[PDB]
Structure formats: C-alpha cells, structure tokens
Design a protein around this motif. Structure first.
Motif, PDB file in Angstrom:
ATOM      1  N   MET A   1      37.342  62.563 -95.586  1.00 55.56           N
ATOM      2  CA  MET A   1      36.713  63.637 -94.827  1.00 55.56           C
ATOM      3  C   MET A   1      36.125  63.127 -93.520  1.00 55.56           C
ATOM      4  SD  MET A   1      33.147  64.424 -96.859  1.00 55.56           S
ATOM      5  CE  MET A   1      34.251  65.065 -98.109  1.00 55.56           C
ATOM      6  N   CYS A   2      35.677  61.869 -93.476  1.00 52.60           N
ATOM      7  CA  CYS A   2      35.218  61.301 -92.214  1.00 52.60           C
ATOM      8  C   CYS A   2      36.357  61.219 -91.207  1.00 52.60           C
ATOM      9  CB  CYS A   2      34.608  59.921 -92.448  1.00 52.60           C
ATOM     10  SG  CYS A   2      32.825  59.930 -92.706  1.00 52.60           S
ATOM     11  N   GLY A   3      37.535  60.780 -91.654  1.00 57.95           N
ATOM     12  CA  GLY A   3      38.686  60.765 -90.761  1.00 57.95           C
ATOM     13  C   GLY A   3      39.060  62.150 -90.266  1.00 57.95           C
ATOM     14  N   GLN A   4      39.068  63.132 -91.173  1.00 52.66           N
ATOM     15  CA  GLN A   4      39.389  64.503 -90.778  1.00 52.66           C
ATOM     16  C   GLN A   4      38.390  65.038 -89.759  1.00 52.66           C
ATOM     17  OE1 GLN A   4      39.613  66.808 -94.342  1.00 52.66           O
ATOM     18  NE2 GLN A   4      41.683  66.124 -94.862  1.00 52.66           N
ATOM     19  N   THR A   5      37.098  64.810 -89.998  1.00 51.61           N
ATOM     20  CA  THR A   5      36.072  65.261 -89.066  1.00 51.61           C
ATOM     21  C   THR A   5      36.248  64.610 -87.705  1.00 51.61           C
ATOM     22  OG1 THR A   5      34.489  65.673 -90.849  1.00 51.61           O
ATOM     23  CG2 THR A   5      33.608  65.347 -88.635  1.00 51.61           C
ATOM     24  N   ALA A   6      36.539  63.307 -87.683  1.00 54.09           N
ATOM     25  CA  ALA A   6      36.749  62.624 -86.412  1.00 54.09           C
ATOM     26  C   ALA A   6      37.887  63.264 -85.632  1.00 54.09           C
ATOM     27  CB  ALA A   6      37.025  61.141 -86.651  1.00 54.09           C
ATOM     28  N   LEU A   7      39.028  63.490 -86.290  1.00 55.77           N
ATOM     29  CA  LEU A   7      40.171  64.070 -85.586  1.00 55.77           C
ATOM     30  C   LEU A   7      39.863  65.474 -85.076  1.00 55.77           C
ATOM     31  CD1 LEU A   7      42.995  62.946 -88.036  1.00 55.77           C
ATOM     32  CD2 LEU A   7      42.409  61.891 -85.849  1.00 55.77           C
ATOM     33  N   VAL A   8      39.271  66.315 -85.931  1.00 61.14           N
ATOM     34  CA  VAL A   8      39.028  67.705 -85.554  1.00 61.14           C
ATOM     35  C   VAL A   8      38.036  67.787 -84.401  1.00 61.14           C
ATOM     36  CG1 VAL A   8      38.004  69.853 -86.337  1.00 61.14           C
ATOM     37  CG2 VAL A   8      39.679  68.698 -87.764  1.00 61.14           C
ATOM     38  N   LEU A   9      36.946  67.017 -84.467  1.00 59.13           N
ATOM     39  CA  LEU A   9      35.959  67.054 -83.394  1.00 59.13           C
ATOM     40  C   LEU A   9      36.496  66.440 -82.109  1.00 59.13           C
ATOM     41  CD1 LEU A   9      32.554  66.178 -85.105  1.00 59.13           C
ATOM     42  CD2 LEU A   9      33.496  68.420 -84.571  1.00 59.13           C
ATOM     43  N   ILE A  10      37.351  65.418 -82.203  1.00 57.57           N
ATOM     44  CA  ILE A  10      37.943  64.858 -80.993  1.00 57.57           C
ATOM     45  C   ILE A  10      38.826  65.892 -80.311  1.00 57.57           C
ATOM     46  CG2 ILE A  10      39.730  63.268 -80.223  1.00 57.57           C
ATOM     47  CD1 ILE A  10      38.455  61.135 -81.977  1.00 57.57           C
ATOM     48  N   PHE A  11      39.636  66.612 -81.086  1.00 60.47           N
ATOM     49  CA  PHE A  11      40.562  67.553 -80.463  1.00 60.47           C
ATOM     50  C   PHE A  11      39.859  68.813 -79.966  1.00 60.47           C
ATOM     51  CE2 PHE A  11      44.196  65.208 -82.238  1.00 60.47           C
ATOM     52  CZ  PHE A  11      45.023  65.266 -81.140  1.00 60.47           C
ATOM     53  N   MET A  12      38.856  69.302 -80.697  1.00 61.53           N
ATOM     54  CA  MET A  12      38.173  70.525 -80.283  1.00 61.53           C
ATOM     55  C   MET A  12      37.347  70.306 -79.022  1.00 61.53           C
ATOM     56  SD  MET A  12      37.990  73.576 -82.225  1.00 61.53           S
ATOM     57  CE  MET A  12      38.374  74.170 -83.865  1.00 61.53           C
ATOM     58  N   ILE A  13      36.539  69.252 -78.999  1.00 56.44           N
ATOM     59  CA  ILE A  13      35.511  69.108 -77.973  1.00 56.44           C
ATOM     60  C   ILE A  13      36.011  68.316 -76.771  1.00 56.44           C
ATOM     61  CG2 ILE A  13      33.174  68.287 -77.550  1.00 56.44           C
ATOM     62  CD1 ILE A  13      32.428  68.866 -80.312  1.00 56.44           C
ATOM     63  N   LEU A  14      36.809  67.273 -76.992  1.00 53.72           N
ATOM     64  CA  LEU A  14      37.227  66.419 -75.888  1.00 53.72           C
ATOM     65  C   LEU A  14      38.510  66.905 -75.223  1.00 53.72           C
ATOM     66  CD1 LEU A  14      35.451  63.893 -75.244  1.00 53.72           C
ATOM     67  CD2 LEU A  14      37.456  62.535 -75.845  1.00 53.72           C
TER      68      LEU A  14
END
Ligand SMILES: CCCCCCCCCCC(CCCCCCCCCC)(CO[C@@H]1O[C@H](CO)[C@@H](O[C@H]2O[C@H](CO)[C@@H](O)[C@H](O)[C@H]2O)[C@H](O)[C@H]1O)CO[C@@H]1O[C@H](CO)[C@@H](O[C@H]2O[C@H](CO)[C@@H](O)[C@H](O)[C@H]2O)[C@H](O)[C@H]1O
Ligand SMILES: CCCCCCCCCCC(CCCCCCCCCC)(CO[C@@H]1O[C@H](CO)[C@@H](O[C@H]2O[C@H](CO)[C@@H](O)[C@H](O)[C@H]2O)[C@H](O)[C@H]1O)CO[C@@H]1O[C@H](CO)[C@@H](O[C@H]2O[C@H](CO)[C@@H](O)[C@H](O)[C@H]2O)[C@H](O)[C@H]1O
Ligand SMILES: CC/C=C\C/C=C/C/C=C\C/C=C/C/C=C/CCCCOC[C@H](COP(=O)(O)OCCN)OC(=O)CCCCCCCCCCCCCCCCC
Ligand SMILES: CC/C=C\C/C=C\C/C=C/C/C=C/C/C=C\CCCCOC[C@H](COP(=O)(O)OCCN)OC(=O)CCCCCCCCCCCCCCCCC
Ligand SMILES: CCCCCCCC/C=C\CCCCCCCC(=O)N[C@@H](CO)[C@H](O)CCCCCCCCCCCCCCC
Lengths: 641, 643
Positions: A503-516
């Motif tokens: 879930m940490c990996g999933q959160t990293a990917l999702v937040l990187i793509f949404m915000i950055l």
C-alpha cells in the motif's frame, strides 16, 4: 510410548444430525515400530492424524503424544520433532526444488550446510528431476515425492505420513518401505502411516484397522494373519522468532514477483485509472457550436461572414463587436442566412443554439443606452439578442449561458471604457469580492480526486488480503506451516508488513501522478495526507480480514466485496456533494467508512486546514474507530469457528 | 471386436517441450469380456479412455469403437449405447438423487417409469440413502455410488468405467465386481475398468499392463500367473524387462440451479434494484441546507436567528434591504445573522457558513439615488448601494448554486420595484433574452444526464459476470464433457445457455426501467419500445464478451481480474458521468470505438430529447452494438479453434 490416544471423541455437523466420527478410541504406538492405520474412507483417519499433530481438538477424552498435550507444553508436536505430510500437496508452485527445501530448512532452524547434503541424498533416493525445476512444472506424481523429501528433510523423531504412496511406481514403493523399515529398526524413531493398499503394509510392526468410529483390532501382521490362518491381509479385513519471520517475508515478497498477473493488477491498474480519470473527467466542454443569424452583415458562406467594425467611438455595428468578445475556445461560430435554418440546425443536432441579431440592432441599442428609464417598448425588443438554447445537457447548458453573459459584461465594460466613462456603471449591485477559500473559476476534478485516491487505496487492499488468506488456508499451506513451528502471531505480523509495503508503493505512485504530473493542487500538509491514505489502507486490510474470516470460497468473497463496494461509493459523496441527499440519508451516510475521511481529505487539499480543525480530524477518528470495529468483528467471528 | 487401437500417438506441449503420452499402442477388446487396464501414473489411462470415447483426439493413429471412428458417422459412442463414468464426480449439487437420475433418463430418452424401476433396483443394490436427499449433503463416498448408478442406469452395450471402486468398502468392491461379471456373462456387454488395486483385477478376462506409453502384456490373467511362474498380480508387474426433448431438459435444469442458489439471486436481481434506488436519492439533486452569514446594518441586531426584517410592500421604498432578502430562495439558503462585517467573514473561514452579505448602513439612500440618477451617478453612490459577498468557492457545485440564487433573487427584486410604480418590468432585463429552450427546460438535472449511463452499465457488466462464471465452473468439473457423451450436441448446449441468459436480463431490464421511470420520475420523452430493444441488445453484447473471457481463461479468479480490468477503464471513457466533450481531441476519437460510448449517446437522445430511430445519432448506437456482437463471436471462435 509415542502416542497414547485414550477415549477419544469427535463429531461434525450440528444438533440436527451430528456426524459421529472418531468416537471412543483406544490407540497406542510404541517407539521403534512402524504403525499401520487402515480404513475405508480417506477422512476418518485424516481427522485422527490432524488431532494427533495438533491442528484440531477433540470434544471429550484425553490425547497424549511425545510427552504431554499436543500443542501447549511438554510435547513437541507443534515443533521440529515431528515430520508431517498432508494428504494433499501443500507446496508453493513458484519455488524451485532447492528454494522449497531451503525455506523449510530455515523454518526448522537447520544450518544451510546440512540442507545441501540432505537435498542430494533425497534427490538420489527419490530420483527426482533437476533441483532447479519449478514445482508448478512438475507432474502430479513428482509433487508427492517432493513433499516426501520435505517431510523427511529435517530428521524428525515421529513421522506422521498421510498416504505417501498412491501414484508411485511399485519399484519405488518397495524402496520407500525398505527405507522406512531401515530407519525405524535401529533408530529411536517411530512411523505412523495410512495406506489404501492393505496388502502393501506387510512390513509394519503393528497394524490397527479402523472400522466405523473405533480401532477394530490391534496386532502385528503375523499374529493377526495366523489367528484365522488367512492368506492375505485384505481377507482379514473382510471378516529465535526473528529467524522464522525473515523466511516468511522473503517468500511473501517472492510469490508476488513471479506472478506477473498480480503485479499488473495491483500496480498498473491504479496508475492507468488515475491517468484516465485525470484526462477525461472534470474538464470544461470545448468545441461547442453555435448558429449566428447576424443580419447586419451580408451572407457569404457557412464559415465566413466578414465581421469588421471600429474599435473607437461612433458605435458602427455592435453586433460584430459583441461576437468578438465571445470566447474562442468553447464556442465555434457557424453562420446561417435566416432565423429558421438556425433553429432547424439546433433541432437536427448541428448546433447548440442560435443568436439572430436583428438588422436594427445598433440603431436600437444606441437608443436604449441613451433613453434610460423612459424607453419606449419598440426600442426594447429590437435591441435584444434572442437565444434559443438546447438545455437537454445540464453542464453544456450552463457553460453556454455563462459565456453568453460574461461576454456581454466585457462588451459593456469595453463600451464604457472607450467612451471615457466609469466602468462601474455596467455592474449589478451584487458585488462578488475576492473568494475566501478558492478561485472564481473552480474545477470539478479537484472535487472528485480526494475520494478517488481513498477509493483506490481502500478497495485494492480488501481483494488482495481476502485472496491471499483464502487461497492459502484452503490449500493446506497455513496448516502445514503451523505444524513446522510458526505461531499465528508471526504469520499475521509478516502479512501486515507485506500489505503495508504494497500500500505504501500504491500511495506513492498515485500521489506522484495526481499531484506532480497533473495539476491537482495541494494547499495543506502532505504528511497528513499520506497518513490518512495509509490509515484508509489499513482499514481496507481489516475489512479483508473480516471477509476472509467469514468466507471459505474465493468466489463468495468477490461477491461480498462487490456487494459493498457500490453503495459505499454511492453514499460517501465521492462524485456529488453530500448536501444534496435527503436529511435522513445524510445522517446515515456519515457513519460509513469512507465519508468523513473523504471530507477531511478534501478540506486538506482544497482549503489547507490543519489537523486542529474538527472537519479534518473527524476523519482520522472515524478511520481509527472503524479499524477497531473491524478487528473486533473479525475476532468475534473466529470464536464459533 | 469392440475397441481396436493401432499405432496411437499423442503428446502435449509445444515442439520444444515434448510430453509423449502414447506412442505405438496396440489394444483389442472383444465383445462380452471385461478388459481391465492397470497403470502407474493415473493420466495415461485417462487419456486413452478420453481418446476412446471421443472427448479427446489422437495426433496419429486409428481408433475403431462399436463400428466406426468414435463420433464421425457410424459409431454410437458420443450418445447412448455407451456408459461413461469419469474419474472425478461430475454431478450437480443442487439436485437430489431422484432428480439426478431423472435428468439423465430424459437426456437419453427413457420413459418416466423405466427410470423409477432402475432407481428402485440401484438404490437397493448400491446401499444408498433415501432418494429425496440432496447431492451436496451426501458424503464424499456416497457421491461416487450415485455416479456409478448414473453410468449403469440406461443399460448400454459398452461400459467404460474410470476408477469405480475408490472410497468404498471392500465388501461393496466385491459386490460391484460380482455385478459386473454377472451382467457381462453370456451376453453382449463389454466393460473397460481402470482400477488401481492390482490384485482385484484377476476376475477380468484380460489384463492391460501399461508402461512408457505402450502395453507390455495384453493377455488373460490366468496365463499371466502361469507363464512367469509368479503367484501374484503385483509381483508380475514388477518383472522389469428429437432435439426438442434435450433442449427442454437443459432449460429446466438451468432455472432450478439459479432458483436454488439464494446468493446468486440476490447478486443479480436484488443488487441492481438497490443500486438504482441509491442513485436517484443521492446523485443529481441540488444542495439544500446552505447557510449564509448576514450583516444588515440597516436594522437593530438581536439574535443569531432573528433580525425583525420588516418593510412596506406597497411603495416609498422604506428599507429595501429586508425587501431583497425577502426574495431569497427559502429552499436552498438559510439565513444567520452576525453583528459585524469582520465577525461574519471569520464564520466563513471556519465551517459555519458559505458566504457573507453585509448590507451597508445606508443601502436604501444610495440605491434609490442610484436608479433615479441613471448614468450620472457619482462614485460615492456606487459604493454604498452595492452588496458585498465573500463566497467560499472551494466546491464547484455549491459555488454555482450560491452565485445563481443571489443574482436570480435580484431580478425579482428589480422587476418588483418597477411594476409596483406602474412601469414595464422589461426595463430590468439584459439584452441577451433566452427564449424558450428547444429541448429540455430552464432547470436541467444532472441525474437525468447520468441516468442513461447507469442502465447500460448495469446490464452489460452483469451478463459478463454471469456468463463467464457459469461456463468456467461447469467446464472445469467435467460436467460439460459428461453431458456431451450422453448425446447433447454443442448446438443444444449453446442454445440453452443463450435462452437462459435472455430471460435473465429481460427480468433485469424490467426492474431497472420500472424504478427509474415509473417510481422516481426520470423523464422519457421518446418511445419506450426502442429503449427496451437497445437495452436488451447491450445485454447480448455483454454476454458475447463472457464467451471470450471463458474461452481463454481456466481458473475463475483469473476471469474476475479480466472482467474488472476492462470494467474500470470503460466507465472513464464512455462519457457516463461527464460529457464526452471534455476529453482531449485524440482521446475523444478513440473513445467512440468502445462498446458503450455510442450506445449511451443514443439512449440519452431518446430519453431526454425524444428522437426516433430515423435520426443518425440514434441508430448509430444500434449498429455499433451489432458490430461488437459479431466481433466478440469472431474473437472467441478463433481462440477455440487455435487452442
Ligand atoms: C499480501 C501478500 C500475500 C502473498 C502474495 C499474494 C499472492 C499469493 C497468491 C498468488 C495467487 C493468488 C493471487 C490472487 C491475488 C489477487 C486476486 C484479486 C482478485 C480480484 C477480484 C496468484 O495465482 C497466480 O495467478 C497467476 C496470474 O499470473 C495465474 O497464472 C495464470 O496467468 C498467468 C499470466 O500469464 C499465466 O502465465 C499462467 O499460465 C496462468 O495459469 C495462476 O492462477 C497463478 O499462478 C495464487 O497463487 C497460485 O497458487 C496456485 C495454486 O492454486 C499455484 O498453482 C500452481 O502450482 C500448483 C502446485 O501445487 C499446481 O497444482 C497448479 O496447477 C499450478 O498452477 C500457482 O502457481 C500460484 O501462483
Ligand atoms: C445464464 C447462465 C445460466 C446458468 C445458471 C446456473 C448458474 C448457477 C451456478 C452455481 C454456482 C455458480 C455461481 C455463479 C456466481 C454468479 C456471479 C458471478 C460472481 C461475481 C463476479 C453457485 O455457487 C454457489 O453459490 C452459492 C450461493 O448460495 C454458495 O453457497 C454459499 O453461500 C450461500 C449463501 O449465503 C450459503 O447459504 C451457503 O451455505 C454457502 O455454501 C455455494 O457455495 C457456491 O458454490 C456454482 O455452483 C456450485 O457448484 C459447486 C461445485 O463447484 C456445488 O458444490 C456441490 O457440488 C459438488 C458435489 O455435488 C461439490 O463441489 C460440493 O461438495 C457440493 O456442495 C454447489 O452445490 C453449486 O451450487
Ligand atoms: C469492456 C470491453 C473492453 C475491451 C474489449 C476488448 C479488447 C479485445 C477483445 C478481446 C481481447 C482481450 C481481452 C483481454 C485479453 C488479453 C489476452 C491475454 C490474457 C490471457 O489470459 C491468461 C491469464 C488466464 O490464463 P489461465 O487462467 O491460467 O488459463 C490458462 C490459459 N493460458 O490471464 C491472467 O491471468 C491475467 C489476470 C489479469 C491480468 C491484468 C488484469 C488487469 C490489467 C491492468 C493492466 C493495464 C495496464 C497495461 C499494462 C502495460 C503497462 C506496463
Ligand atoms: C465499504 C464496505 C465496508 C463496510 C460495509 C458495512 C457494514 C459492515 C458490517 C459488515 C459485516 C458483514 C457483512 C457479511 C454478512 C452476512 C453474511 C452472509 C454471507 C456469509 O457467508 C455465506 C456465503 C459464504 O459462505 P461459504 O463460502 O460457503 O463458506 C461456508 C460458511 N458458511 O456468502 C455468500 O454466498 C453470499 C454471496 C453474495 C450475497 C449477496 C451479494 C450482494 C448483496 C446484494 C443484496 C442487497 C439487498 C439486500 C436483500 C434484501 C431485500 C430482499
Ligand atoms: C464487469 C465486472 C463487474 C461485475 C459486476 C458489475 C455489475 C454492475 C456494475 C456496476 C453497477 C452500477 C453501479 C455503479 C457503476 C456505474 C454507475 C456509476 O455511478 N459509477 C460511478 C460510481 O460507481 C463510477 O464508477 C465512479 C468511479 C470513480 C472512482 C474510481 C475508483 C475505482 C476503484 C478501483 C479499485 C477498487 C477495486 C475494488 C474491488 C476490486
């Protein structure tokens, strides 16, 4: 002795008809003997062996093996002093024949030096193929040989074998029985074996025949066979703890890497749907067409009108001057000759509206702007734009209406400015000052993103946990690992760590793509956003715990998860404000797992509120309470199970 | 002769990886004899039996059973005249014993009492419980005697048995062998039994030792014993070197297998109803309890819920700040009162309001002089005659509601000031005059826009789940292959499944359309005849996608990943929850080729506009769904041929 079953009792079923199996036993096994447990169905003795090892309990009576009780104190049947072969093949298919032995060697605590020697010995004995071949690629008969090797690999002192010789060539079954006789004869060992070939178990030092629910007889083969002078046995029957956590963690991180389907499903699906949602949903409609029936200029084409005027005084045309102020992005002008073809185009579907500037538009607008409150009805009908819009679509019908009035506001302000006058004279008394908590041109995707993030992270954990805990208990892998000495605390700890990393990996990917990558804004603190997302993931994992605790088939779990995935998404205000629901439903929907968390995350992202605001930490409180409730329900379900 | 196999060759895998199973086999079974087939692995014998009965083919060889090639022109193997019992238990768990026997009696073509007589004989012979006991409740050893009775019920001339005596007592083993010898003796009954207990096979008239894909010894057992000198059968093994009656039976069984599974009924019939109800209650409606912080300095301030707003309705323009607030919409705006302009903004900065109003202390004096001066108004009167609104615009769908309600309420205010003094209200209108809309109304609903996209997605994706799961489950447990031997062609299996599914989404369409239109008042300006046809055509398109998934997948859990892997991307690309006009230029072009993009646009035009089939935007959804039905059948037919 080695096992001293006395007055055993058991019964399946319920009060309506309890399945009376394994009732009133009297079984005893002495050291240095090859026991033989024979029967008719392959489940009246599997229950007895499961009770002996310790993975099941008896209703009444006493059980005694290897010193004391099977699995509490004194005895060592939940330890490394007993070798167990389950009736099925309880093996992982992603491991080599060498890794599948190193894993158990580390679980049993053996040094890696002796594992190679015993591996070569067992490979020689069982003529298994090359040690680097994957287990899933072996046939249905070599898997049993590998399981036999794993059972013998750690040198136990009480071997419990559940049908080891079923699909074996007889030239190899003879060798297997010879080896058992060899190791039992002189060593301080014991063997308990159940077979379906009654005649094969002739070298056993003691045979106990199981009929109905009790041991029919107990005697050596020779005395039993010579009691009636029989010729065959069938005729007689026809009368540290950190060392065991590292291995689990490594196997868990390897089983997920060699399965490309799982990696795709849980790592490339969230990214793909985040990209699609950001690219498709929430943007302003563009390319809408209009029909212009401007009668103040000559008609040449359907895509050309020659709209020219003067930018100063004298108010030349004022119908091309207005159209010049229309936005060039979401509106494409199309020209028609008379006000009937335009409305026909709207009816047929070639446009979204019509305008129809009257041929007396300028001479009447410049009279209305001067006469003021004393204006005759004639110069109030020939100085107006007539708009017939298509209001079947709500969002498209709002943008057209808004952009046909903002353009007129700009037109009037330009007219006042070019006349050297105050531009405040073209303003309605309602004065919208600077927004307190946003921008005058909001977006709809900034409303849906905090609530898509939580939905993804929450619902990609329930499925993974339920599948991982269902396809593992039903295949006899958890029970096989438990007998090796792994307490239930270590399995849960390893699973929680693995799920947390995923879930940490999933959160990293999702937040990187949404915000950055895209333009979704974050005006608050990113650490608290990460903490909230991780807490929602843990809540989803606890829900998966409950689902896997109350379900036993992998097809019922998906139905149970899908039946609750829809209403929670439809009631938590993810795609529409929660202020629209009725009063009673608005009170019920705040107790759902994802409502307050979504509200608090939305406040964090789109307002920048800290953790001290009640609307922000109510989400944290709700998530924690739901985690506690899910854990309590999961523990309560496993009480009557 | 009964079975003749010559030069049989069969292997699995690809060219690189060889898995030779049979190679140069020679078999010969007489008529009126028991063959018996003993091996080691457990799969070569199964492959030989499957090649005999026809469910599997031979790479190179020649098979002759009961007269000809097994299942081509003149061999009665793929129907009656043969009795096949598979290695596994291919039985339906929802049926009792009597229903299980009656279904196979109707498949073959027996009468209703010639099944009862066989039931009476076999129940006593095999020592089975009462015939009204469900199969799923039966034990693991009693689900094998039922299979044996099913295989032996119709009295064929060639019984092919695969491990009959397993999970059974030795007494019943001897009873079964005695019955086999009795039915075989002095007759035209041939038995082929692949047992694993080698010593019990001596009663047979032949022995079929298998090793390395061939047959070492094919001879009588009394010769096997007294030719090698051995006295055993194991130690010698150790010497190393009418179609309407079949569619009716399949249709009736299909319904009773969905009726008797309560969990299936709730998922496919009670879940769509709950989804429709919660969509019409939550999504689409306008916000209602919006609060406003009001600072009226023209009146004394008492409470946070009371201000005493009073004025004269006639003329003379007493206060005009309570008069404007009187026109505010009572449904979607709640009025709360604060004493200072600075205290009201701090309420917005917390979760206590959505805006502030702040009428100045001399609003009436300035406003009256503003409208009585026209374009000669000085800047001072343009400042004290205006309302100062500080909105909270973090929410898009609430900022629109608040902005529109605060400007609509001023149109009524101005059109009542002039009009109560004998003037035409048209003087208070902007030049842009919006005439009557050609389609829709002045107050469109978002729930009417999303409504067409929910009917199509529910029906389409609930047929993928039902078709994929039913076909994968029945194929993997040998139920589908057991029926084929009984004499059920693949045409009758496909026909019965299409009809069973058709009545499923016919019921689903009625409930979804009734609750959305009749109960919750979703408008339908078009023809309801074409709405039903298009909604059903989407169900068949979804069902044909179920064939594709089940043709390429073997485990059920892989089908869900495939069905869910395509269910998510489509909803974000078919314009269900947002206009398709928001997409980029290239993604919009690609999106129209998806299954649901052009059908949703067509259904939305028939509901919210009333267009007929003759409009291009309406029949483009019918053609784009017929094409995807053909494409899904072509893809699924290519896979089965190539695998
Ligand atoms: C928190 C950490 C938990 C631990 C890590 C989690 C993973 C652990 C479980 C892994 C798991 C569950 C995955 C479900 C999770 C997601 C479901 C969500 C559902 C969404 C609603 C994935 O299962 C795998 O999925 C594969 C997809 O790649 C699939 O392979 C398919 O597609 C491929 C693609 O091209 C394609 O190449 C391949 O040919 C396809 O077959 C197979 O089913 C399987 O390999 C099950 O593991 C499987 O177990 C099988 C025995 O049952 C085991 O069987 C093998 O060995 C047996 C010898 O005993 C033997 O008898 C079997 O015959 C043999 O096959 C599999 O080897 C093993 O892998
Ligand atoms: C147009 C097509 C026409 C086809 C119409 C026919 C369709 C019917 C298919 C039936 C089917 C597919 C479900 C498909 C799901 C559909 C949604 C897709 C998934 C979402 C993406 C339902 O599957 C059943 O669903 C039941 C739900 O009620 C469930 O019951 C559970 O929850 C209950 C509720 O709480 C609860 O009360 C109950 O206690 C639970 O047990 C059963 O366990 C489950 O197997 C599978 O059938 C099942 O097959 C089983 C062996 O494979 C078979 O087991 C029996 O047979 C064997 C010995 O004979 C042996 O194996 C077993 O020993 C024996 O027991 C079952 O008897 C049979 O039913
Ligand atoms: C709504 C409609 C939309 C589109 C319709 C159609 C387009 C084409 C029409 C048909 C073509 C295709 C249908 C899908 C097929 C394709 C064929 C081949 C698969 C054959 O699948 C074999 C086994 C199962 O095999 P198995 O069970 O073991 O049986 C043994 C057989 N070898 O799949 C599995 O495991 C996989 C389990 C789920 C895998 C992924 C799940 C979710 C995907 C998310 C990833 C998306 C990102 C893309 C990745 C690239 C970035 C790096
Ligand atoms: C975001 C969501 C989070 C939270 C949501 C809210 C509150 C959470 C409280 C949660 C606690 C529990 C829920 C579980 C409840 C209870 C146990 C039941 C099943 C236990 O299980 C049995 C087997 C499986 O049993 P089995 O596999 O055979 O194992 C043998 C064991 N007997 O289930 C099955 O078949 C069920 C398969 C799908 C059944 C329905 C699927 C979709 C529902 C749609 C219907 C909705 C309308 C309601 C109908 C009423 C009007 C007519
Ligand atoms: C075909 C496979 C599905 C089988 C069953 C299908 C039966 C009917 C389907 C929907 C019934 C119609 C009822 C709602 C469906 C359409 C109507 C609608 O209003 N749809 C919207 C809201 O539902 C739309 O979906 C909004 C998505 C935005 C958030 C996206 C996050 C997605 C999570 C991804 C990972 C979670 C994984 C959880 C388990 C992995």
């Amino acid at each position: 002795h080695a096992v001293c079953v006395r007055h055993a009792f058991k019964q399946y079923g319920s009060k309506k008809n309890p399945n009376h199996v394994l009732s009133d036993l009297n079984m005893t096994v002495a050291k240095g003997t090859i026991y033989g447990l024979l029967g008719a169905s392959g489940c009246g003795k599997t229950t007895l062996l499961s009770c002996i090892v310790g993975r099941r309990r008896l209703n009444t009576g006493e059980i005694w093996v290897l010193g004391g009780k099977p699995g509490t104190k004194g005895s060592g049947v939940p330890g490394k002093r007993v070798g167990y072969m389950p009736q099925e093949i309880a093996l992982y298919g992603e491991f080599s024949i060498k890794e599948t032995m190193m894993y158990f060697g580390w679980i049993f605590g053996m040094e890696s030096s002796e594992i190679n020697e015993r591996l070569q010995f067992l490979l020689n004995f069982l003529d298994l193929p090359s040690q680097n071949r994957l287990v899933k690629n072996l046939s249905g008969g070599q898997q049993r040989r590998v399981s036999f090797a794993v059972a013998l690999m750690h040198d136990p002192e009480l071997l419990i074998l559940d049908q080891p010789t079923v699909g074996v060539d007889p030239l190899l079954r003879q060798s297997i029985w010879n080896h058992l006789v060899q190791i039992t004869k002189d060593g301080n060992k014991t063997v308990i074996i159940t077979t379906h070939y009654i005649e094969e178990a002739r070298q056993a030092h003691t045979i106990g025949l199981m009929r109905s629910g009790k041991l029919l007889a107990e005697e050596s083969p020779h005395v039993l066979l010579s009691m009636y002078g029989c010729q065959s046995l069938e005729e007689v029957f026809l009368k540290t703890s950190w060392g065991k956590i590292k291995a689990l963690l490594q196997k868990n991180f390897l089983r997920m890497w060699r399965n490309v389907g799982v990696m795709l499903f849980i790592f490339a699906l969230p990214v793909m749907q985040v990209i699609l949602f950001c690219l498709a949903i929430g943007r302003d409609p563009t390319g809408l067409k209009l029909a212009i029936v401007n009668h103040e200029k000559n008609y040449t084409n359907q895509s050309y009108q020659e709209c020219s005027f003067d930018y100063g005084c004298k108010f030349s045309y004022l119908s091309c001057r207005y159209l010049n102020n229309l936005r060039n992005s979401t509106i494409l002008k199309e020209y028609y000759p008379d006000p009937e073809s335009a409305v026909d185009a709207v009816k047929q579907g070639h446009a979204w509206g019509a305008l129809y500037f009257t041929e007396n538009f300028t001479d009447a607008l410049v009279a209305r702007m001067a006469l003021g409150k004393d204006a005759d009805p004639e110069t109030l009908d020939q100085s107006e734009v007539r708009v017939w819009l298509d209001m079947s679509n709500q969002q498209i019908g709002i943008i057209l209406q808004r952009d046909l009035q903002l353009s007129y506001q700009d037109f009037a302000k330009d007219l006042l400015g070019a006349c050297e006058q105050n531009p405040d004279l073209a303003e309605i008394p309602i004065s919208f000052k600077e927004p307190i908590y946003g921008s005058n041109k909001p977006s709809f995707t900034d409303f849906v993103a905090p609530g898509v993030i939580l939905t993804i992270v929450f619902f990609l954990a329930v499925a993974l946990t339920s599948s991982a805990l269902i396809i593992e208990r039903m295949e006899g892998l958890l029970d096989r690992s438990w007998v090796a000495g792994v307490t239930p605390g270590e399995i849960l700890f390893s699973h929680v760590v693995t799920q947390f990393v995923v879930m940490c990996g999933q959160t990293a990917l999702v937040l990187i793509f949404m915000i950055l990558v895209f333009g979704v804004q974050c005006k608050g603190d990113i650490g608290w956003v990460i903490v909230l997302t991780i807490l929602q993931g843990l809540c989803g994992m606890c829900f998966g715990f409950v689902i896997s605790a109350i379900c036993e088939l992998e097809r019922n779990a998906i139905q149970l998860a899908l039946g609750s995935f829809y209403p929670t998404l439809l009631l938590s205000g993810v795609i529409w404000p929660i202020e629209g629901m009725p009063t009673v439903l608005r009170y019920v929907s705040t107790f759902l797992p994802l409502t307050l968390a979504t509200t608090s995350l939305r406040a964090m992202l789109t307002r920048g509120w800290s953790i001290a605001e009640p609307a922000v930490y109510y989400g944290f409180l709700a998530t924690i309470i739901w985690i506690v409730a899910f854990l309590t329900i999961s523990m309560l379900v496993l009480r009557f199970k």
